PDB file of C-alpha atoms and ligand atoms in Angstrom:
ATOM      1  CA  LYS R   1     111.822  67.225 122.652  1.00 14.83           C
ATOM      2  CA  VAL R   2     108.509  69.102 122.511  1.00 15.91           C
ATOM      3  CA  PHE R   3     105.989  67.243 124.633  1.00 14.23           C
ATOM      4  CA  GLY R   4     102.252  67.169 124.196  1.00 14.22           C
ATOM      5  CA  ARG R   5     100.166  68.219 127.208  1.00 13.05           C
ATOM      6  CA  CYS R   6      98.908  64.768 128.162  1.00 12.31           C
ATOM      7  CA  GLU R   7     102.246  63.164 127.243  1.00 12.84           C
ATOM      8  CA  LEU R   8     104.044  65.512 129.662  1.00 10.12           C
ATOM      9  CA  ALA R   9     101.461  64.919 132.376  1.00 11.42           C
ATOM     10  CA  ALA R  10     102.054  61.173 132.073  1.00 10.88           C
ATOM     11  CA  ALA R  11     105.852  61.565 132.180  1.00  7.81           C
ATOM     12  CA  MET R  12     105.572  63.825 135.244  1.00 10.10           C
ATOM     13  CA  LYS R  13     103.354  61.293 136.991  1.00  9.17           C
ATOM     14  CA  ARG R  14     105.745  58.486 136.035  1.00  9.71           C
ATOM     15  CA  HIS R  15     108.516  60.442 137.801  1.00  9.78           C
ATOM     16  CA  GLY R  16     106.646  61.121 141.030  1.00  9.08           C
ATOM     17  CA  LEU R  17     105.638  64.739 140.476  1.00 10.20           C
ATOM     18  CA  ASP R  18     101.889  64.404 140.757  1.00  5.47           C
ATOM     19  CA  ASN R  19     100.831  65.918 144.080  1.00  4.02           C
ATOM     20  CA  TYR R  20     104.484  66.356 145.070  1.00  2.96           C
ATOM     21  CA  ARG R  21     104.559  68.854 147.971  1.00  8.79           C
ATOM     22  CA  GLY R  22     100.784  69.029 147.510  1.00 12.43           C
ATOM     23  CA  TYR R  23     100.918  70.405 143.942  1.00  9.33           C
ATOM     24  CA  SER R  24      98.565  68.599 141.614  1.00 12.57           C
ATOM     25  CA  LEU R  25      99.699  67.466 138.180  1.00 11.24           C
ATOM     26  CA  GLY R  26      97.892  70.371 136.475  1.00 13.32           C
ATOM     27  CA  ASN R  27     100.039  72.851 138.378  1.00 10.48           C
ATOM     28  CA  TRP R  28     103.227  71.236 137.066  1.00 11.76           C
ATOM     29  CA  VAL R  29     101.915  71.020 133.495  1.00  9.59           C
ATOM     30  CA  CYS R  30     100.789  74.667 133.599  1.00  7.45           C
ATOM     31  CA  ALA R  31     104.196  75.734 134.893  1.00  5.31           C
ATOM     32  CA  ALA R  32     105.965  73.812 132.112  1.00  4.48           C
ATOM     33  CA  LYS R  33     103.655  75.322 129.507  1.00  2.65           C
ATOM     34  CA  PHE R  34     104.520  78.893 130.428  1.00  5.31           C
ATOM     35  CA  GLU R  35     108.163  78.277 131.326  1.00  8.83           C
ATOM     36  CA  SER R  36     109.199  76.314 128.221  1.00 10.24           C
ATOM     37  CA  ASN R  37     106.132  75.705 126.003  1.00  8.68           C
ATOM     38  CA  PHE R  38     106.823  72.014 126.774  1.00  8.72           C
ATOM     39  CA  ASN R  39     110.256  72.111 125.038  1.00 11.28           C
ATOM     40  CA  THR R  40     112.980  70.288 126.927  1.00 13.12           C
ATOM     41  CA  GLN R  41     115.686  72.213 125.082  1.00  9.64           C
ATOM     42  CA  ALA R  42     114.531  75.712 126.088  1.00 11.81           C
ATOM     43  CA  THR R  43     117.233  78.034 127.438  1.00 13.59           C
ATOM     44  CA  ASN R  44     116.882  81.687 128.432  1.00 15.90           C
ATOM     45  CA  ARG R  45     119.499  84.134 129.723  1.00 17.34           C
ATOM     46  CA  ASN R  46     118.574  86.287 132.678  1.00 16.29           C
ATOM     47  CA  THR R  47     119.723  89.892 132.965  1.00 14.65           C
ATOM     48  CA  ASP R  48     122.015  88.995 135.882  1.00 15.74           C
ATOM     49  CA  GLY R  49     124.011  86.567 133.745  1.00 16.32           C
ATOM     50  CA  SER R  50     122.485  83.320 134.955  1.00 15.09           C
ATOM     51  CA  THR R  51     120.539  81.100 132.550  1.00 14.03           C
ATOM     52  CA  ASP R  52     117.349  79.063 132.921  1.00 15.90           C
ATOM     53  CA  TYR R  53     117.295  75.540 131.493  1.00 16.42           C
ATOM     54  CA  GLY R  54     114.768  73.035 130.332  1.00 19.04           C
ATOM     55  CA  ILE R  55     111.125  72.213 130.664  1.00 17.71           C
ATOM     56  CA  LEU R  56     110.910  73.981 134.054  1.00 17.30           C
ATOM     57  CA  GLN R  57     113.490  76.738 133.364  1.00 15.72           C
ATOM     58  CA  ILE R  58     115.769  75.893 136.283  1.00 18.09           C
ATOM     59  CA  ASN R  59     118.261  78.646 137.072  1.00 20.05           C
ATOM     60  CA  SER R  60     122.023  78.277 137.093  1.00 20.98           C
ATOM     61  CA  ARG R  61     122.231  80.939 139.834  1.00 19.05           C
ATOM     62  CA  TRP R  62     121.315  78.270 142.437  1.00 20.48           C
ATOM     63  CA  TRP R  63     120.459  74.855 141.041  1.00 20.70           C
ATOM     64  CA  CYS R  64     122.801  73.640 138.277  1.00 19.33           C
ATOM     65  CA  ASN R  65     126.301  74.277 137.016  1.00 20.78           C
ATOM     66  CA  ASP R  66     126.876  75.923 133.624  1.00 17.49           C
ATOM     67  CA  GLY R  67     130.400  77.215 134.244  1.00 20.13           C
ATOM     68  CA  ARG R  68     129.493  80.798 133.449  1.00 17.78           C
ATOM     69  CA  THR R  69     127.437  82.110 136.369  1.00 18.49           C
ATOM     70  CA  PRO R  70     130.082  83.653 138.681  1.00 17.78           C
ATOM     71  CA  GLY R  71     129.086  83.466 142.339  1.00 18.42           C
ATOM     72  CA  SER R  72     126.264  80.981 141.753  1.00 15.15           C
ATOM     73  CA  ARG R  73     125.545  77.632 143.402  1.00 13.41           C
ATOM     74  CA  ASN R  74     124.771  74.101 142.099  1.00 17.88           C
ATOM     75  CA  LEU R  75     122.311  72.685 144.663  1.00 17.24           C
ATOM     76  CA  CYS R  76     120.909  69.935 142.443  1.00 14.76           C
ATOM     77  CA  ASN R  77     124.502  68.748 141.767  1.00 13.50           C
ATOM     78  CA  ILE R  78     124.054  68.495 138.020  1.00 14.28           C
ATOM     79  CA  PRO R  79     125.328  70.159 134.870  1.00 14.43           C
ATOM     80  CA  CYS R  80     122.694  72.489 133.503  1.00 13.01           C
ATOM     81  CA  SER R  81     122.908  70.614 130.189  1.00 14.30           C
ATOM     82  CA  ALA R  82     121.387  67.581 131.935  1.00 14.54           C
ATOM     83  CA  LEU R  83     118.203  69.647 132.316  1.00 12.73           C
ATOM     84  CA  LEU R  84     117.788  69.748 128.491  1.00 11.15           C
ATOM     85  CA  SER R  85     117.459  66.001 127.914  1.00 11.49           C
ATOM     86  CA  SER R  86     114.447  64.362 126.275  1.00 11.23           C
ATOM     87  CA  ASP R  87     114.115  62.273 129.458  1.00 13.43           C
ATOM     88  CA  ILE R  88     112.768  64.585 132.173  1.00 10.98           C
ATOM     89  CA  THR R  89     114.232  62.718 135.184  1.00 12.60           C
ATOM     90  CA  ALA R  90     116.932  65.286 136.002  1.00 13.43           C
ATOM     91  CA  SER R  91     114.547  68.246 135.699  1.00 13.22           C
ATOM     92  CA  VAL R  92     111.972  66.456 137.879  1.00 13.80           C
ATOM     93  CA  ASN R  93     114.502  65.523 140.567  1.00 12.42           C
ATOM     94  CA  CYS R  94     115.757  69.094 140.695  1.00  7.64           C
ATOM     95  CA  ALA R  95     112.250  70.613 140.664  1.00  7.90           C
ATOM     96  CA  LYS R  96     111.432  68.463 143.692  1.00  6.99           C
ATOM     97  CA  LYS R  97     114.302  70.156 145.545  1.00  5.12           C
ATOM     98  CA  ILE R  98     113.254  73.638 144.419  1.00  8.38           C
ATOM     99  CA  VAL R  99     109.588  73.229 145.411  1.00  4.78           C
ATOM    100  CA  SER R 100     110.719  71.980 148.815  1.00  5.23           C
ATOM    101  CA  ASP R 101     112.931  74.968 149.603  1.00  4.36           C
ATOM    102  CA  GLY R 102     110.266  77.012 151.393  1.00  5.51           C
ATOM    103  CA  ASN R 103     108.133  78.997 148.906  1.00  3.80           C
ATOM    104  CA  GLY R 104     106.533  76.107 147.062  1.00  5.89           C
ATOM    105  CA  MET R 105     105.830  76.729 143.399  1.00  5.68           C
ATOM    106  CA  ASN R 106     106.237  80.488 143.807  1.00  4.63           C
ATOM    107  CA  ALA R 107     109.890  79.793 142.913  1.00  4.73           C
ATOM    108  CA  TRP R 108     108.580  79.705 139.315  1.00  6.42           C
ATOM    109  CA  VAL R 109     107.478  83.317 138.711  1.00  7.16           C
ATOM    110  CA  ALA R 110     105.496  82.254 135.634  1.00  8.89           C
ATOM    111  CA  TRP R 111     103.592  79.745 137.782  1.00  5.19           C
ATOM    112  CA  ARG R 112     102.753  82.488 140.298  1.00  4.05           C
ATOM    113  CA  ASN R 113     101.763  84.964 137.552  1.00  2.99           C
ATOM    114  CA  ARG R 114      99.936  82.619 135.152  1.00  5.13           C
ATOM    115  CA  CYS R 115      98.898  79.382 136.930  1.00  8.24           C
ATOM    116  CA  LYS R 116      98.430  80.030 140.656  1.00 10.00           C
ATOM    117  CA  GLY R 117      94.773  80.229 141.546  1.00  8.39           C
ATOM    118  CA  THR R 118      93.551  79.248 138.067  1.00  6.23           C
ATOM    119  CA  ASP R 119      91.677  76.145 136.912  1.00  7.49           C
ATOM    120  CA  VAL R 120      94.877  74.143 136.564  1.00  8.44           C
ATOM    121  CA  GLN R 121      93.005  70.839 136.177  1.00  9.07           C
ATOM    122  CA  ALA R 122      92.166  71.991 132.652  1.00  4.03           C
ATOM    123  CA  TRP R 123      95.788  71.190 131.801  1.00  5.76           C
ATOM    124  CA  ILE R 124      95.211  67.455 132.412  1.00  4.05           C
ATOM    125  CA  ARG R 125      91.600  67.371 131.168  1.00  5.15           C
ATOM    126  CA  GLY R 126      90.925  64.309 129.055  1.00  5.18           C
ATOM    127  CA  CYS R 127      94.370  62.763 129.636  1.00  4.98           C
ATOM    128  CA  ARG R 128      94.565  59.010 130.186  1.00  4.25           C
ATOM    129  CA  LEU R 129      96.750  58.996 133.271  1.00  4.05           C
TER     130      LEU R 129
HETATM  131  C1  LIG J   1     118.740  80.447 148.141  1.00  4.48           C
HETATM  132  N1  LIG J   1     117.514  79.894 147.565  1.00  4.48           N
HETATM  133  C2  LIG J   1     116.457  79.987 148.552  1.00  4.48           C
HETATM  134  C3  LIG J   1     117.136  80.673 146.391  1.00  4.48           C
HETATM  135  C4  LIG J   1     117.738  78.519 147.196  1.00  4.48           C
HETATM  136  C5  LIG J   1     118.675  77.854 148.192  1.00  4.48           C
HETATM  137  O1  LIG J   1     117.939  77.093 149.107  1.00  4.48           O
HETATM  138  C1  LIG J   2      93.088  75.159 126.913  1.00  5.86           C
HETATM  139  N1  LIG J   2      94.429  74.735 127.231  1.00  5.86           N
HETATM  140  C2  LIG J   2      94.759  73.520 126.493  1.00  5.86           C
HETATM  141  C3  LIG J   2      95.346  75.801 126.840  1.00  5.86           C
HETATM  142  C4  LIG J   2      94.582  74.480 128.663  1.00  5.86           C
HETATM  143  C5  LIG J   2      93.580  73.422 129.111  1.00  5.86           C
HETATM  144  O1  LIG J   2      92.308  73.994 129.219  1.00  5.86           O
HETATM  145 CL1  LIG J   3     113.204  70.153 121.435  1.00  8.53          CL
HETATM  146 CL1  LIG J   4      99.827  64.623 124.439  1.00  6.48          CL
HETATM  147 CL1  LIG J   5      97.315  71.189 143.960  1.00  5.22          CL
HETATM  148 CL1  LIG J   6      95.266  69.289 138.467  1.00  5.04          CL
HETATM  149 CL1  LIG J   7     113.927  72.185 133.616  1.00  5.67          CL
HETATM  150 CL1  LIG J   8     129.436  79.033 137.177  1.00  6.95          CL
HETATM  151 CL1  LIG J   9     126.246  74.236 145.153  1.00  6.92          CL
HETATM  152 CL1  LIG J  10     128.941  70.342 135.861  1.00  7.50          CL
HETATM  153 CL1  LIG J  11     110.647  61.295 130.366  1.00 10.41          CL
HETATM  154 CL1  LIG J  12     103.243  75.074 149.412  1.00  8.93          CL
HETATM  155 CL1  LIG J  13     115.009  79.668 142.811  1.00 10.21          CL
HETATM  156 CL1  LIG J  14      89.207  65.020 132.654  1.00  9.05          CL
HETATM  157 CL1  LIG J  15      95.638  60.956 126.661  1.00  8.85          CL
HETATM  158 NA1  LIG J  16      98.738  72.799 125.331  1.00  8.34          NA
HETATM  159 NA1  LIG J  17     111.643  81.686 134.050  1.00  6.05          NA
HETATM  160 NA1  LIG J  18     125.351  77.621 139.115  1.00  6.80          NA
HETATM  161 NA1  LIG J  19     134.223  78.838 134.571  1.00  8.91          NA
HETATM  162 NA1  LIG J  20      90.340  75.660 140.091  1.00  7.44          NA
END
């Protein structure tokens, strides 16, 4: 599923992500934009052999199991394929764990490089939320 901006904002709010760990909804929408272009089915292989999955590009090195990342962990206790669903619940639940692990949203390098410090409220501008 490819979400619209306001549609994704609403789904993220519906699942408890707005202001989770102090990160406003615009931060989460901005991260999803630059991680996946709002596409729940996005997958990208990393040079180390792990793969990032879904709307928030969650890594199989630590967070989900894909059966092909030797030496990795599965800290969200989910198959990585569950992070590709049209329903964002699994990605949201896992992102809540990631953002709580100590470095906040810096875990998402694209958030640090493209969203952090910017006018992230522009991502939810005009949305009926
Ligand atoms: C090891 N990480 C910090 C990357 C995640 C585990 O908490
Ligand atoms: C302009 N964008 C839609 C790209 C972000 C909100 O300002
Ligand atoms: Cl899709
Ligand atoms: Cl929309
Ligand atoms: Cl914030
Ligand atoms: Cl915001
Ligand atoms: Cl994801
Ligand atoms: Cl594995
Ligand atoms: Cl694990
Ligand atoms: Cl699994
Ligand atoms: Cl959803
Ligand atoms: Cl923080
Ligand atoms: Cl991580
Ligand atoms: Cl507005
Ligand atoms: Cl709207
Ligand atoms: Na957009
Ligand atoms: Na990424
Ligand atoms: Na893994
Ligand atoms: Na295996
Ligand atoms: Na700002």
